[PDB]
């Protein structure tokens, strides 16, 4: 696989978003993966509605602002038969009744693939599929106060991930890292991005729960 990869270069990624005071990170991770897979297929980048996921994916197992899984979001898009655009179904940072309107659906998927729990497999996936949804252990002050450089939390766990994010690529400095897009606005870390330690024994478990949708 390449030494470096960055799907932002090819137009697979939308600007950094902000979930606010709502545990909907799983929705932003899912939309990010979907926006990337829809782009690969149609060549068109459309921001997808996280709110649509927050209000309607309860049957798949999600819990609005209290938590969820990226795979449940993909399953929803599949069972629902569509997903509305970010512009048609604006983010409200709070759970409301489902208002999905198929007239504004702009994305879809026929399932999803869960990558094997190895950084080596995550690397191949990132290089051949595009942006990948992953869960990270962000359970530390350090992640939260992150500003720049390669993030490495001596106390990270590769078992208790609690934050869903997006891997847009990977590379090395002149030392390896995963290029990660967060959903905490661009005033956090590097304009909303973070370079997670790569090939350091699955640091914070980036490759423990990685997956993407098949559109």
CATH superfamily: Cysteine proteinases
Gyration radius, in Å:
16 Å
Give the count of helical stretches. Answer: 5
Number of strands: 10
Disulfide bonds: 22-65, 56-98, 156-204
Binding site for Zn(2+) 4: 92, 96
Binding site for Zn(2+) 6: 160
Binding site for Zn(2+) 7: 162
Key features of this structure:
monomer; 10 strands; Glycoprotein; two-stranded antiparallel ribbon; 215 residues; Cysteine proteases; monomeric; six-stranded mixed β-sheet; alpha+beta; hydrolase; Cathepsin B, Chain A
Kindly describe this structure.
With 215 residues, the chain is α+β, with helices and mostly antiparallel strands. It has one domain (1-215): Cysteine proteinases (Cathepsin B, Chain A, Alpha-Beta Complex). The protein has helices spanning 25-42, 50-56, 70-80, 119-128, 141-145; strands at 5-6, 83-84, 105-107, 112-114, 132-136, 150-151, 163-172, 176-181, 193-197, 211-213. Strands 1, 5, 6, 7, 8 and 9 form a six-stranded mixed beta sheet that branches. A hairpin with a 3-residue loop joins strand 7 and strand 8. It is globular, with a radius of gyration of 16 Å.
């Amino acid at each position: 696989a390449p030494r470096s990869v960055d799907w932002r270069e090819k137009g697979y990624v939308t600007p950094v978003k902000n979930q606010g005071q709502c545990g909907s990170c799983w929705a932003f991770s899912a939309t990010g993966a979907l926006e990337g897979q829809m782009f690969r297929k149609t060549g068109r980048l459309i921001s997808l509605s996280e709110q649509n996921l927050v209000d309607c994916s309860g049957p798949q197992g999600n819990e609005g602002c209290n938590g969820g899984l990226m795979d449940y979001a993909f399953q929803y898009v599949q069972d629902n038969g569509g997903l509305d655009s970010e512009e048609s179904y604006p983010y409200e940072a709070t759970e409301e009744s489902c208002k999905y309107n198929p007239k504004y659906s702009v994305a879809n998927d026929t399932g999803f693939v869960d990558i094997p729990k190895q950084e080596k497999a995550l690397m191949k996936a990132v290089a051949t599929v595009g942006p990948i949804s992953v869960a990270i252990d962000a359970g530390h002050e350090s992640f939260l106060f992150y500003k720049e450089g390669i993030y490495f939390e001596p106390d990270c766990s590769s078992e208790d991930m609690d934050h869903g994010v997006l891997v847009v690529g990977y590379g090395f400095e002149s030392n390896k890292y995963w290029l990660v897009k967060n959903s905490w606005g661009e005033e956090w870390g590097m304009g909303g991005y973070v370079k997670m330690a790569k090939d350091r024994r699955n640091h914070c478990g980036i490759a423990s729960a990685a997956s993407y949708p098949t559109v």
